[PDB]
Design a protein around this ligand. Sequence first.
Ligand SMILES: CC(=O)N[C@@H](CC(C)C)C(=O)N[C@H](C(=O)N1C[C@H](O)C[C@H]1C(=O)NCc1ccc(-c2scnc2C)cc1)C(C)(C)C
Lengths: 86, 141, 103
Amino acid sequence: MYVKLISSDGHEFIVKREHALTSGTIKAMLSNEVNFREIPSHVLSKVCMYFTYKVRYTNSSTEIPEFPIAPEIALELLMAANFLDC
Amino acid sequence: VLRSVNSREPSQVIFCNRSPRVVLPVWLNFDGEPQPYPTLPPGTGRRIHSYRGHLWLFRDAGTHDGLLVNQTELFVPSLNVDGQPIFANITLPVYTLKERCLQVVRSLVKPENYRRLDIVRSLYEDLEDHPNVQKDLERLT
Amino acid sequence: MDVFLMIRRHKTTIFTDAKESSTVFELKRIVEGILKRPPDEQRLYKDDQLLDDGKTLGECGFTSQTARPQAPATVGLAFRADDTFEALCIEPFSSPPELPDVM
Ligand SMILES: CC(=O)N[C@@H](CC(C)C)C(=O)N[C@H](C(=O)N1C[C@H](O)C[C@H]1C(=O)NCc1ccc(-c2scnc2C)cc1)C(C)(C)C
């Protein structure tokens, strides 16, 4: 099953519920759509990619690549991760 | 507590850096002091002489970010079974998104400018509280 | 091998994975389960190229080493309203601000 995470600018990101539960903050907001008034789509898209990456590479032996973050999104992405606790 | 035991029983090891980071190997000596050893560029290996019961950990040489070795924090050379060296596979952990963001922000902002960033005081503190072996030795203890 | 995708239409983006050996039609069935629109009312695209139902994702250039979890490949999606297909439209994500001086 999937959940919808909606950015401040209206982008609707549909991701697997278990991936989204990577964030306890998101867990609280569900307990199946969540709006983020402070997280724009260029940040929330990256957050979703992080979920996929975390779930793919957690408990795996195959070599782990760097999670890439452009300098231009790092500050907002930092603020988002701190809010989402992930 | 966290110290190498003086076994005197040799153990040959391959430090194998399967990370994109320059790696600082750190040996915990008999008094528990971290002793740094020469670095390993990304994707390179070294054959080295250590001993059973000796304790090692591995860090990004530039930033001291935590690395894993055979999927754990610490590496202890074991008995060489039929002459073969023990492989110590050094890898990136799956960092939290927060910690990865802090890495990137640290790598772009001089520490004297952390305070100039528009963020909650707690994140300034998080940036300032950068990775450090001494803190990790306290946490593991 | 798994490929990791963003399937995108207007302001909708689905994050999902699929087998390199799976087909375009099969990806439409995945979209159908999520967005409740049958395969025949869907067009999938790679860039501006319409994808053929019978082709594997690998054949269309969605390979495990380029469609990665941390950087998924984009599949475009267009719906048929009644008689005719809408044109492919993907709303871009927002723009980051200018780097602060200190960065
Ligand atoms: C002195 C003592 O009470 N015991 C000895 C063994 C005893 C049989 C004399 C002993 O443990 N010696 C240490 C020792 O030889 N060590 C400590 C670690 O187990 C590894 C080993 C060592 O230093 N080997 C040489 C070495 C040189 C370079 C490297 C590295 S790491 C990355 N690149 C290189 C080239 C790795 C190992 C020291 C550093 C005290 C001399």
